[PDB]
């Protein structure tokens, strides 16, 4: 029952500062423009120890399955090939991505009826708010 409150089908409703986060990560102009339009649906499920997050949109579909604390290979929506480790810290999913000698952290939190995704690269944060679909 570890991630119960995350499970479901979620739709992006709002974003703040996402262009600057993508700049900080190194995303090029064309991908920033088309990625910034997308309103993905994120489908989170759990089966035993395995968590799956599937995202579907216009622009790109992505899918990760993982065990908490166990590093895995990920392909991001901007097409980075990263090494990722996801843990639970005080009821927040904490996701670190390493690639090309860089690092970024994505936190996923339940806040009221919303799922809040906070993305940090060095000094720059972006907040992406999802609602139940
Ligand atoms: C640095 O450039 C980026 C460009 C696009 C997305 C991200 C990740 C943002 C954080 C994040 C979500 O909102 C979900 C869903 C991501 C998603 C967006 C669009 C289409 C399919 C899936 O998964 C997460 O990793 C970074």
**Secondary structure in 3-state letters for 60-109:** CCEEEEECCCCCEEEECCCCCEEEEEEEEECCEEEEEEEECCEEEEEEEE
Report the SS3 class of residue 25: helix
Residue ranges making up the domain that contains 101: 4-120
Total structural domains in the chain?
A: 1
Is the minimum distance from the CB of 57 to ligand 1 under 6 angstroms?
A: yes
How far apart CA 18 and CA 24 sit, in angstroms, is 10
Whether 51 maps to a domain, the answer reads yes
Method used to obtain the model: X-ray
The count of residues in the chain is 133
Residue nearest to atom 1 of ligand 1 (CA): 22
* Helix or strand holding residue 110 (H, E): strand 102-111
Identify the H or E element spanning 11: strand 8-16
Separation of alpha carbons 108 and 106, rounded Å: 7
Tell me, in angstroms, the distance from the centre of ligand 1 to residue 77's CA.
Answer: 5
Q: Pick the closest to residue 66 from 91, 48, 43, 42 (CA basis).
A: 48
Resolution of this deposited model, Å: 1.0
129 in a structural domain = no
Q: Evaluate: CB of 106 within 6 angstroms of ligand 1.
A: yes
Distance 76 CA to ligand 1 centre (A): 7
101 assigned to some structural domain: yes
The Cα 9–Cα 30 span in angstroms is: 28
Residue 33 pairs in a beta bridge with: none
Of 128, 112, 93, the C-alpha closest to 19 is: 128
- Annotated binding-site residue numbers for a fatty acid: 128-130
3-state secondary structure of 18: helix
């Amino acid at each position: 029952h570890m991630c119960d409150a995350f499970v479901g089908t979620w739709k992006l409703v709002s974003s703040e500062n996402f262009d600057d986060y993508m700049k900080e990560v190194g995303v090029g102009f064309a991908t920033r423009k088309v990625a910034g339009m997308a309103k993905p649906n994120m489908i989170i499920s759990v089966n035993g120890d395995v968590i799956t997050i599937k995202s579907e949109s216009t622009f790109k579909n992505t899918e990760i399955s993982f065990i908490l604390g166990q590093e895995f290979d990920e392909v991001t929506a901007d097409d980075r090939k990263v090494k990722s480790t996801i843990t639970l810290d005080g009821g927040v999913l904490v996701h670190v991505q390493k690639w090309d000698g860089k690092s970024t952290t994505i936190k996923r939190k339940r806040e009221d009826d919303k799922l809040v995704v906070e993305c940090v690269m060095k000094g720059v944060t972006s907040t992406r708010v999802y609602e139940r679909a």
